[PDB]
Amino acid sequence: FQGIDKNWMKIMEKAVETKKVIPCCQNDMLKDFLPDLNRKLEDCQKMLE
Amino acid sequence: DSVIKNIQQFKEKSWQDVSLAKMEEDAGKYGEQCSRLPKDLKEWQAYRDLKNYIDSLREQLPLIIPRHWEKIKEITNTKLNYENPDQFYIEEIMGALDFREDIEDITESADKQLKIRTGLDEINLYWNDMQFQFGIWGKRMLNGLIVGTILERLEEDQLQLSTFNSQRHVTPFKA
After folding, report:
1. Which residue of B has its CA nearest to A18?
2. What angle do helix axes B23-42 and B2-16 make, rounded to 10 degrees?
3. Distance from CA of A47 to the nearest CA of B (A)
4. In A11, B67, B81, B85, which residue has its Cα 20 to 30 A from B152's Cα atom?
């Protein structure tokens, strides 16, 4: 979650740069990471629980 | 003299070259009413022919009143008329039946196609104009305050697009 949060820190650093809806939907990095980050968060969620 | 006074009102309507909507069906109708009982006694076939020409213009004037207008010109025997003529058409629109009424139905369809295309162009603007609603989290970054409002639009537009896809007039802009 130290590392995980960085990848999420950078996604919201990329959100300021390009803010429009159609871009954020089609944006390369942000489309690919949300599925990966979700499994990474869910595994740390279940481990906390 | 009344038959020549109708041929002049037609030449005047020809010189006008502007969408005829009201006055054309009125001028030919009012005179033809008092001409029908008179033309049998009057005989003079040139007057009855002019009254027939005045009636056909009164019919064509209601039919007369973009890509759909160019497609309209195409199925009437005319080429960039609804372009160059709707601008300044002497008597090309007036001159140009079942093949006419079938053409009219192909333009009303082409008019419906464009009205859906404008509806899709309206969608394209609001997706560009909108920007993901970023809200405070402290900056100890920002986050989507309302995704549900954008989700409502997604399904609404997907349903509108599915509703358009069911219409036969979607096919050109279906891609």
Report:
1. B131
2. 160
3. 24
4. A11
